């Protein structure tokens, strides 16, 4: 049908769509920002170690 | 999987004429588009010149 309400209906299709965009480009850029933070803090905390390993 | 839609709507332009012109009356209707064609349903001379 192609009333006002069928065009609310795919209406919400393509807000079904956008939001299918956004939250894959948020949590993937999220989940990226995890693995950043994973792989930065394993970095200092490995300078850290080589300190510690020197030193005993 | 989704699929398109097809709308209507409201419209202020103006429609253009069309005539589903056929192999013989193809010459009379350029005849009389020669002239100007005719606003949206206006009766048509081509049929009969």
Do not use: C, W
Not at chain 1, 10 to 31: P, S, T
Not at chain 2, 24 to 40: L, S
Request: no cysteine; glycine share 4%; charged share 25%.
């Amino acid at each position: 049908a192609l009333s006002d309400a069928d065009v609310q209906k795919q209406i919400k299709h393509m807000m079904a769509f956008i939001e299918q965009e956004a939250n894959e480009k948020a949590e993937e850029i999220d989940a990226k920002a995890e693995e950043e933070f994973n792989i930065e803090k394993g970095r200092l905390v490995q300078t850290q170690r080589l300190k510690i390993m020197e030193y005993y | 999987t989704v699929p398109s839609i097809l709308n209507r709507m409201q419209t202020n332009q103006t429609p253009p004429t069309y005539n589903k012109t056929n192999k013989f009356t193809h010459g009379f209707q350029n005849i009389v588009d020669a002239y100007g064609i005719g606003t949206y349903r206006e009766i048509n001379p081509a049929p009969y010149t």
